[PDB]
Unconditional design. Structure first.
Lengths: 201, 261, 150
RNA sequence: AUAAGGGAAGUCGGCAAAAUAGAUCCGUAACUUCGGGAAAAGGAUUGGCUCUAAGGGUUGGGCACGUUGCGGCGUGCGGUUAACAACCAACUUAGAACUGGUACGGACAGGGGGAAUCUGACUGUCUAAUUAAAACAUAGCAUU
RNA sequence: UACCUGGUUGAUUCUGCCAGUAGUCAUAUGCUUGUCUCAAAGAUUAAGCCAUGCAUGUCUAAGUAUAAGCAAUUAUACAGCGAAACUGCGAAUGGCUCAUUAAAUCAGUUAUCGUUUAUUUGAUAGUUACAUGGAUAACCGUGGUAAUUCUAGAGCUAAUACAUGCUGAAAAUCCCGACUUCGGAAGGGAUGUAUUUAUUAGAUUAAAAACCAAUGCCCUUCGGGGCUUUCUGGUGAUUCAUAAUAACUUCUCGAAUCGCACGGCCUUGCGCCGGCGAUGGUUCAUUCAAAUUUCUGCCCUAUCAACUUUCGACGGCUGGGUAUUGGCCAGCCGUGGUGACAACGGGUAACGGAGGGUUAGGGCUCGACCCCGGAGAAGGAGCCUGAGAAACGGCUACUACA
RNA sequence: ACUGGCUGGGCUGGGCCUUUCCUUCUGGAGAACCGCAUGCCGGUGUGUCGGGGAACCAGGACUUUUACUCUGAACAAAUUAGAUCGCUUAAAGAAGGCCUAUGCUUGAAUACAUUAGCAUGGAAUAAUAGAAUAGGACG
């Protein structure tokens, strides 16, 4: 089948090499698996030495970790928006490592409300459709929460705007074809400015 | 070549086994175990070729099936079991104990030891580090791993092994003034005192030794095996590894022969 | 070396596992711990150049601030080509001995090595290189020191 | 204008008809006056639709005084935006996916080719109304 | 044993080749042939074609026994020896051959901080239970086809085959907090290991202060004198070893297995406890290794002087794939790499080396062949099982034979 | 063959002074030369005595760079050279030997390769580098 040896190549002087031996059991290759966004579907493959790998054909959710805060929550992926290597990867909504995606921001906002007693990204006050208040069953919690809010600090405006829409930018940092999982982190800071300028221009 | 080998050709076996080039085409092919294949002492070679207790291959395994012979206090039942340096071989029915140690010519020799000395060993340490759960451990030259060692013990040292409970009881640092025995190279079997050591960054440091007769020699660090500071802990064989020249051997040979007869 | 910009590519260039967006600010002397530039020492009496520690370039093949370890032979030669990007060609000369005629003859070989942006290399200079893992089809050595010009 | 199977067996003779044909990318011999032969010979691709990338123009640039109905000049200087920002404008080229009764220079337009012999070097000219040729002319060469 | 003689001329001294002389683990052939010790042998021309037979199987006290099996007669669950069949392991080692191959194989010397590893050896894993559920072979019985180590449908029964499954402990660490006197707290959840991602620690190795913010405290005459301080391994070199936190997974492992001995406690219940082996099992170490990899070294030829990038040729970057590195492959961007110190191409009656033959010294020539490395099973390609094969005494297809 | 001697003459090597001699810091253990008192017949154990560190070991920094030669390390068995032992001799083989033993004892050495790579001593011969627009050395 597919081979990844260097015998068929051409030497650095330009000379053409001669036939040496038939293809070997090692040095083989395998058909690439193009992950897509959809209902979960994974195949098992028996690799060298009796181990196993996990082919991911369709995925829709995975772990994503918030850097500054330090929380990791499972959420779903909406779509692929940028890819530094090839544009056709973006159009197909096929996801690999170092692919910029958009994820649901619901689980991360909820944790912020419980940890800090302040609201994050709420411009629905004009509509006030879903305004609701729950009685706080203590008063030391404000002492605990106000200490956290005054100490750690506040979110920068760039990340706050995304929370209003409910969509967040992330980068896949796993290899779905190998491990069968799509994992990443929320990108922020100067790295956010690089992609936002490149994304719409 | 499509897998691992399982045959050993005679004329390709290690030289220090002293095997005749005739009478067969193959060699014992020592099985995998604690000692390297190049420098090991298969049990069949020891029992049949040196002690001459067993006449041939067929009767060599007859002895082993009766669990008569054991090494390091545990019975072994395969004829091609790789024994090596410092190993203790005990045969209770005949009533003697053996220790495998090099002579001055770089080969294994028979060496009687007393029963009181046949209940401990010593081996060079290979690595020290932290294992699973943070428990420190070390591994010796014969693939013995022991947890919770003395923090003062470092690599290249030697440790005395109980051989009944497998616990370290005292150790020797690796430094100048120690008494050492060589295990590899052309100076194999010599005994000397470490004079000084020179190290080269990038590997392959060398150490300079000195014999009892003021002779001098050098070897790589991987072939030096500390066996004591003074008055070596183990009992050395006859000749004590002094490496007489060819001139003295024939002088001593005739002097001993004519004196006796 | 001369590099116009550090971020001039499709992706974002950064050292792996060096976290850069922390709410609390802590000042530490350690290179990689606090969030500032990371670098190491190769050893074998090789000193880290000043340009490496205080520079802003990003390179994953440089022996300094990189993911390559140097082990094996150390060789010397003279550079003959500097017309690629972060790669040079050195020339090594020796003498082969012909036993029958009891005298020698000249021979030479050509070698390819990776040069880091820390150094500035021109044609006709002597360099010292060290072995590393395969970085390309024909690159297995890395530049370590540039000898002074006459 | 079209024809099953055969494909010049017709005839003084392939006379008449058929076949080839646009553009883009590959490939190309003997011979030679080294300019040619050459479009040699011989192969592949071509619609519709939804997208991606490249090739341009114009106007804006910091202080310190003086004139003047937020500024145009007088200047005194400094700096080279690790080239940014707004607005404006036609066409030409390359690449990818999906789609069909595998069709797409869809009509029109549009070279058959190869191996040799005889003869005039070539472009050019003539028997208006039966002969356009190997005939005439030509540069070059020689004589009076 | 550092050696020479015949032949051009009427005769002479030379250059010069032809011929003679000796060896060969170097093959053939002619004539002849009594004994002892040793024993090469279808390599050369055809890696041309092959009738018949053989060359790979395997059971211990210890995985499964209702043989209309044998043998005894202590075993009313089984119990001695034990065909058949299921299950486990091996069949990838040996043995044969030299077609291809000219920096390729190979030799000596390095590297793996760039990977996989059955087996052997040494350590090591507290989260209905007095025992869970359906199938199948041998066997009985009924058949098909000229034909093969072809197989059908019907009826019984096993597992170390296949598939499920049980906090027996506390402490500590980290979140939520029922409830106030505002200074800590009822009780509630998670917390082994493997898998995947993000974050934190992993110290230095000469010393004396003086300030801002404010708290475990000791002594104490209440004016306070004040404040000594606990760990941290390794390499020439790392983001190493190892540990902690937030989460994740068609998701693992942590024993429903087997044989010998016949023992000890008292609340005497067909109760509790207890020894040595076999076979398995997660991670680290070791062993037999395997795959890649650094430096230098090969015969003749210029009537072979420029070569490499159509459709990767040299390098940069982001990924894909692989046990892992890598232009090994996919996209985007630069214009390089080798050569008179002989590249590139053609010849080889060419597998490489240890080494054989012949000798003053220096050399010339041969090496298919018992040892080591590589490749192949008529010619090409593809793949299953497995720790390990691109296997041919394994399978699928085309070509050529039969 | 043993032993001593020659103001024995030679050969190989190590120390000092001649303008030259030999880098440097930290630590280890500790001598020689010194005096202190305590004891025998002008020398000596004296002791957690001190002025004191010859040499040695471990660690850090500095030193123009190659070729060449010396000594080491690492590297295969068989083969070549070669030591030992009367297979009845020999080509071979790795065996055997001793009184008599219900036992004892030994051998299976050593050299060579040789190009490349890794260390060490030497500093002749052949190349190479340094202060001249001082961009030089030292405190
Ligand atoms: Mg090393
Ligand atoms: Mg017709
Ligand atoms: Mg027709
Ligand atoms: Mg036709
Ligand atoms: Mg006709
Ligand atoms: Mg006609
Ligand atoms: Mg016509
Ligand atoms: Mg027509
Ligand atoms: Mg032309
Ligand atoms: Mg043309
Ligand atoms: Mg054409
Ligand atoms: Mg033509
Ligand atoms: Mg098209
Ligand atoms: Mg056409
Ligand atoms: Mg047409
Ligand atoms: Mg004409
Ligand atoms: Mg007319
Ligand atoms: Mg006409
Ligand atoms: Mg001669
Ligand atoms: Mg003549
Ligand atoms: Mg004559
Ligand atoms: Mg002759
Ligand atoms: Mg006779
Ligand atoms: Mg043949
Ligand atoms: Mg039985
Ligand atoms: Mg087995
Ligand atoms: Mg098998
Ligand atoms: Mg084989
Ligand atoms: Mg044969
Ligand atoms: Mg085990
Ligand atoms: Mg099972
Ligand atoms: Mg780590
Ligand atoms: Mg890469
Ligand atoms: Mg050039
Ligand atoms: Mg040859
Ligand atoms: Mg051949
Ligand atoms: Mg050969
Ligand atoms: Mg042949
Ligand atoms: Mg032969
Ligand atoms: Mg054949
Ligand atoms: Mg297996
Ligand atoms: Mg094969
Ligand atoms: Mg095959
Ligand atoms: Mg066969
Ligand atoms: Mg076979
Ligand atoms: Mg002999
Ligand atoms: Mg030297």
């Amino acid at each position: 089948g597919i081979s990844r040896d260097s015998r068929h190549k051409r030497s650095h002087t330009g000379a053409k090499r001669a036939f040496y031996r038939k293809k070997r059991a090692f040095e083989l290759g395998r058909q690439p698996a193009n992950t897509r966004i959809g209902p979960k579907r994974i195949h098992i493959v028996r690799t060298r030495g009796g181990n196993h790998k996990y082919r991911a054909l369709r995925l829709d959710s995975g772990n994503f970790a918030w850097g500054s805060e330090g929380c990791t929550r499972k959420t779903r992926i909406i779509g692929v928006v940028y890819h530094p290597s090839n544009n056709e990867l973006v159009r197909t909504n096929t996801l690999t490592k170092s692919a910029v995606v958009q994820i649901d921001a619901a689980p991360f906002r909820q944790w912020y409300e419980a940890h800090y007693g302040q609201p994050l990204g709420r411009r629905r006050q004009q509509k006030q459709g879903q305004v609701v208040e729950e009685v706080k069953k203590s008063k030391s919690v404000e002492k605990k929460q106000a200490a956290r809010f005054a100490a750690h600090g506040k979110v920068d405006p760039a990340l706050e705007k995304q929370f209003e829409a409910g969509r967040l930018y992330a980068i896949i940092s796993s290899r779905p074809g190998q491990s069968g999982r799509a994992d990443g982190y929320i990108l922020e800071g100067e790295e956010l400015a690089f992609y936002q300028r490149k994304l719409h221009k | 070549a499509r897998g691992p080998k399982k045959h050993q050709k005679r004329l390709s076996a290690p030289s220090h086994w002293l095997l005749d080039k005739l009478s067969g085409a193959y060699a014992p092919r020592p099985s995998t175990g604690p000692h390297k294949l190049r420098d090991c002492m298969p049990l069949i070679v020891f029992v049949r070729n040196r002690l001459k207790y067993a006449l041939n291959y067929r009767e060599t395994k007859a002895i082993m099936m009766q669990r008569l012979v054991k090494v390091d206090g545990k019975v072994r039942t395969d004829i091609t079991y790789p024994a090596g340096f410092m190993d203790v071989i005990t045969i209770e029915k005949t009533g003697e104990n053996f220790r495998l140690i090099y002579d001055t010519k770089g080969r294994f020799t028979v060496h009687r030891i007393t029963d009181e000395e046949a209940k401990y060993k010593l081996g060079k340490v290979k690595r020290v580090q932290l294992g699973r759960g943070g428990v420190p451990f070390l591994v010796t030259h014969d693939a013995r791993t022991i947890r919770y060692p003395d923090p003062l013990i470092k690599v290249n040292d030697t440790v005395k092994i109980d051989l009944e409970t497998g616990k370290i009881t005292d150790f020797i640092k690796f430094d100048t003034g120690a008494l050492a025995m060589i295990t590899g190279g052309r100076n194999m079997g010599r005994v000397g005192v470490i004079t000084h050591r020179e190290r080269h960054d990038g590997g392959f440091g060398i150490v300079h030794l000195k014999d009892a007769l003021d002779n001098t020699f050098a070897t790589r660090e991987s072939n030096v095996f500390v066996i004591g500071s003074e008055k070596p802990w183990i009992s050395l064989p006859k000749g004590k590894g002094v490496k007489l020249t060819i001139a003295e051997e024939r002088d001593q040979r005739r002097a001993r022969a004519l004196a006796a007869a | 070396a001369t590099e116009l910009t550090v971020q001039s590519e499709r992706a974002f260039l950064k050292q792996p596992h060096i976290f850069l967006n922390s709410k609390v600010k802590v000042k530490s002397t350690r290179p990689g711990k606090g969030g500032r530039r990371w670098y190491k020492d190769v050893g074998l009496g090789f000193k880290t150049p000043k340009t490496a520690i205080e520079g802003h370039y990003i390179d994953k093949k440089c022996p300094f601030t990189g993911m390559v370890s140097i082990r094996g032979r150390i060789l010397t030669g003279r550079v003959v080509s500097t017309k690629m990007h972060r790669t040079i060609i050195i020339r090594r000369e020796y003498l082969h001995y012909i036993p029958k005629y009891n005298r020698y003859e000249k021979r030479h070989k050509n070698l390819a090595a990776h040069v880091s942006p820390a150094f500035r290399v021109e044609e006709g200079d002597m360099v010292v290189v060290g072995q590393c893992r395969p970085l390309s089809k024909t690159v297995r050595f890395n530049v370590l020191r540039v000898l002074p010009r006459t």
